[PDB]
DNA sequence: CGACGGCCAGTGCCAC
DNA sequence: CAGTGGCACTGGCCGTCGT
């Protein structure tokens, strides 16, 4: 086993040279290090161990090093270096699904002060090399007179570079070793630091396995990117503006501009009193100034001529309230609720702060005399919308548009094991939050994601796109789970059609959408009101709802308290707390691993969530490797090509519609094997979609 | 005696009023203002004749200061054939807003 | 002196 | 007592940096 770092002179998207590596090889208790000539000599250190049926050992080496390995051997040896997939681990994938409960900052693409909880320190560490090595680079300059320059401390190998190269190692070798002190997940007979690949993988819990495995496809699926219609989008973000000038520009008509005292530095006191009144603006009291300037010669000096007037503008002694002038602006909360309340709105509810709530909810409920003004209610829920559009799309830090790369492609980043629960979670941008064909330019943002916007690299036809998504999954999980209890009789009837639909009826819910936000709230714990909400009625429409539910099926009582009396021994409220005695504060999950539980209350969620979230992952998995044995090669030089994993659903790039045919019916297969695989107590399905982009596919 | 002024007829009755009119541009919720207020009653009466004192309350008619740079309140505008002849900011005194005034008049 | 940016709570809505 | 996440925008606060 050897555990090794790389220092390149940029981003995967863009790295052209290896700066330096390290290798610490267990067999000889030694570190080795390789400087910008020596790359050669690195890339044969590595391929020794995969030949000899070893281990490498990185820190994110499965998104980082290993790619860029592959790419820098190419451009600067033009060598083809391909690790295999299982001979490599990745500490941050292993400390990931061991630390679970923990955040980390995604190597420092994230500010640690923002994230909460704690953060394992190891880990911190080597997410924060780069920004370190940085401020070192920086200040040596300045002491050496040279300016610095947005990057330049990657642009060329050197010693400090060196120095951090190996505190990597030395680091991730101590990271590696605390991680694999787990009990849980590698067995204590066993020294993991000293066996061969297939022992890893075999004698480690399955858990460890899934983790890297999903991490290696991911990482390939970021690589790939997802096909993205810049032109369309751009229009799009026109026509928003459009929108928006115009309901600015009607807004501002109805609700007009208004000064604020802002500047203030002084207290304003009663001028009889001296009392200091707080309340009042804080106010300026000029300390220079009159209404004449000084005399300049005799008679003036002798009050006999007139004396310069003072053009100033201020006067000694004279205070002042200093104000700003402010213009309506619709996207604040803060004055949408002034003009309202100064139209006769009187606020119901208000935020655990003071401030009332002003959400689409109350917007909707609001009433005021003027009828120009409360038509200017739906103006400003439009203009709050539009808004989030083009934020999202084109104004955002986070923007498709900002993002959109060379190759046509948005190349969204996912932390495999991001959530608590085992789900996977993505940014920059957040290719899981897209807005649903449903809702407004839902379509339009939907369609600019898709297969079709990918020419082949040979023909110059654009690829299809098969879309597949896993079929009432956390519900059939759910009757997995409390067949113990009704005999599979849930596992049976939610088979009988679909469940959402049956659901949407039963309840008498407008759309199959609704049945959905219904049943997953009612089935993980939402009060009466809460419901009410949901179905857009009150408290009472809630009980009876939440009542005829729980009596169709009893059972889900049965699994609660079950989950109950294996976690809780006691609990209690304290203030704005439940202070709770655990007898075990985690689940174990379908591969075996803890799942941190957060509350007794959404023990059920934990429990249900990462059943289907492990189930989806190994489907993913399996589903490409069922592809791969099938012949297909997957990348646009290829035949398919993963664009998303979305919690249950992926979408995938097909070079024609056979493969998509072929690629939906494997993911059906794949599912399949899953539930086989796990001894499911509930047949699972999934459906799938072709079509040319995210808005026919979903 | 003070003329209570409104956006719509700010502009004839000060910009075309042909004569020295005084505006204090003016806020219910400013300490100064209110210090003022009392100052200005009587400086109408003694200028009544060679002046006009006008007041704007800038939350009832947010039309008007925006177009005259409004930094600070309040805020003392002598108008003469609709050119603003002297800006003075800040609650003078009894005293110095009458030499503020018998130096422009 | 004050415009402006990184950091931050508050609030809300998007998706699964 | 729905749950898991990302992220945009307003308004505070405060230190760097140009008027
Ligand atoms: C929408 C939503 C979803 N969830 C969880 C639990 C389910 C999974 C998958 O959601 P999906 O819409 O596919 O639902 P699914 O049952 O898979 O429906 P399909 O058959 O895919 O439509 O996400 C939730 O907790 N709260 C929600 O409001
Ligand atoms: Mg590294
Ligand atoms: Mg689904
Ligand atoms: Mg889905």
Known sequence: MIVSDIEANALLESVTKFHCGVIYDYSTAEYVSYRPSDFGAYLDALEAE????????????????????????????????????????????????????????????????KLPGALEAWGYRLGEMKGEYKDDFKRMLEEQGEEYVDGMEWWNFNEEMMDYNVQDVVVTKALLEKLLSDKHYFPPEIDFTDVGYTTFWSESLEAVDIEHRAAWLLAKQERNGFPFDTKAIEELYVELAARRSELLRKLTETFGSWYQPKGGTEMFCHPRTGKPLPKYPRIKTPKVGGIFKKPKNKAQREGREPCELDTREYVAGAP???????????????????????????????????????????????????????????????????????????????????????????????????????????????????????????????????????????????????????????????????????????????????????????????????????????????????????????????????????????????LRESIQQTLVESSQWVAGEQQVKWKRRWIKGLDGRKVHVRSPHAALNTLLQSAGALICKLWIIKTEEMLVEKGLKHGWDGDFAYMAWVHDEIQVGCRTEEIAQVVIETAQEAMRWVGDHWNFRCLLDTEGKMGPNWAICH | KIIHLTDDSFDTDVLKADGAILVDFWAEWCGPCKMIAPILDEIADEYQGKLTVAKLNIDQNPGTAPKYGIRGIPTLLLFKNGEVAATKVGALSKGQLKEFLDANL
């Open chain 1, 50 to 113: 995969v030949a000899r049926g070893g281990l490498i050992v990185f820190h994110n080496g499965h998104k980082y090093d290993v790619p860029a390995l592959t790419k820098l051997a190419k451009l600067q040896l033009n060598r083809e270096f391909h690790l295999p997939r299982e001979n490599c681990i990745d500490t941050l994938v292993l400390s990931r699904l061991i630390h679970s409960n923990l955040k980390d900052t995604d190597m420092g693409l994230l500010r640690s002060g």
């Open chain 1, 320 to 558: 002042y309230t200093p104000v700003e002038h402010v213009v309506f602006n619709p996207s604040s909360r803060d004055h949408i609720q002034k003009k309202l309340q100064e139209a006769g709105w009187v606020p119901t509810k208000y935020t655990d702060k003071g401030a009332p709530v002003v959400d689409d909810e109350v917007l909707e409920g609001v009433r005021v005399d003027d009828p120009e003004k409360q038509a200017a209610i739906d103006l400003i829920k439009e203009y709050l919308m539009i808004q989030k559009r083009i934020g999202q799309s084109a104004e955002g830090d986070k923007a498709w548009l900002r993002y959109v790369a060379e190759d046509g492609k948005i190349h969204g980043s996912v932390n495999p094991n991001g959530a608590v629960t085992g789900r996977a979670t993505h940014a920059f941008p957040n290719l899981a939050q897209i807005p649903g064909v449903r809702s407004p330019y839902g379509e339009q943002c939907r369609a600019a994601f898709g297969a079709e916007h990918h020419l082949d690299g040979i023909t110059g036809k654009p690829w299809v796109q098969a879309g597949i998504d896993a079929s009432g999954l956390e519900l059939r999980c759910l009757a997995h789970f409390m067949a113990r209890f009704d005999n599979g009789e849930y596992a049976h009837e939610i088979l009988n059609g679909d469940i959402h639909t049956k659901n949407q009826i039963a309840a008498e819910l407008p759309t199959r959408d609704n049945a959905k936000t219904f049943i997953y709230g009612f089935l993980y714990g939402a009060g009466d009101e809460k419901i009410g909400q949901i179905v857009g009625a009150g408290k009472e429409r809630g009980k009876e709802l939440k009542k005829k539910f729980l009596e169709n099926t009893p059972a889900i009582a049965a």
